[PDB]
């Protein structure tokens with residue numbers, strides 16, 4: 496139906512011979528597994544090698560991942576095996592090419608001979624010290640280590656729309672992943688999304704969870720998921736192809752797997768993360784390049800990752816599979832098996848969830864009256880399983896049943 500793949504990690508830029516050239520060799524495996532969408536890293540010239548400090552946005556040849564021609568071919572290959580491609584869009588902030596008379600880097604260069612994206616400090620937000628105080632105040636949060644772009648500026652909107660239109664029409668990207676989406680307003684995001692008509696979008700809105708005295712996230716995370724639901728409503732709800740990453744489900748699942756699976760049924764009997772309020776708009780995941788990989792800012796318990804996948808890959812939401820977990824952790828076949836269960840049972844983003852049990856050592860759940868998912872160390876559950884259901888997949892801390 497709709498299965499995402501994050502096609503990179505934090506070390507990818509180092510790849511001998513180039514990341515894109517390397518990933519070319521994995522296109523068939525990705526497509527064959529039932530993945531429908533692959534998320535590739537920011538493609539522009541950037542001060543930082545990973546790509547999250549972009550300067551010359553049209554300058555794809557300066558990317559550490561590989562050059563313009565290589566990206567285009569890689570996107571062509573995914574397209575040839577039916578896979579859509581998502582660009583990591585980093586537009587909250589931008590680095591400037593040249594110093595003004597203050598000696599501050601705030602004269603931008605787009606990477607082309609003409610004046611596209613050749614902004615100056617007037618395009619920087621009002622209170623950002625890289626700027627000159629003439630821009631509008633930031634519509635969202637600030638990123639302290641680079642200039643924040645003033646998205647209310649009319650030249651900015653128009654020229655970023657033109658760049659996205661080139662990423663789409665000429666480079667061949669189909670969809671966007673919005674980096675640091677808290678940095679600018681949903682109204683600003685709506686403008687870019689509506690103007691470019693992507694097949695799919697996902698916002699990265701990452702807010703710290705409120706914790707109890709014991710340092711664990713509160714059982715109640717409604718303020719956390721409400722923020723996600725509010726952003727999606729405000730960009731147009733079902734009149735938009737935009738979703739948000741389910742960082743509520745990530746944060747809860749991180750702790751629930753550690754002998755606390757009762758966290759996976761909220762007060763109202765429903766899932767406690769974004770998928771429990773608006774599953775169609777929730778993009779779930781076990782880890783990404785920030786939370787895991789070599790940054791490990793919020794890692795999933797490493798011994799329990801297949802519990803993570805058993806959950807996201809059978810549940811409502813748009814599940815996203817992380818590169819390392821798929822190719823480097825010895826888990827390819829098990830993940831592939833879960834995706835095929837998902838697809839042949841016709842599980843989809845708005846599928847229906849009925850939580851059966853949620854104890855410390857057990858989480859059990861039926862999806863669309865057709866799949867039952869079990870995670871945790873408790874193995875004896877057959878009295879809890881309805882007649883007609885048979886085990887179709889199992890591993891360390893997980894098992895899946897299908898109806899007949």
Ligand SMILES: [Ca+2]
Nearest residue numbers: 605607608609
């Ligand atoms: Ca230029």
Ligand SMILES: [Ca+2]
Nearest residue numbers: 638641642643
């Ligand atoms: Ca800034």
Ligand SMILES: [Ca+2]
Nearest residue numbers: 635636643678
């Ligand atoms: Ca901002």
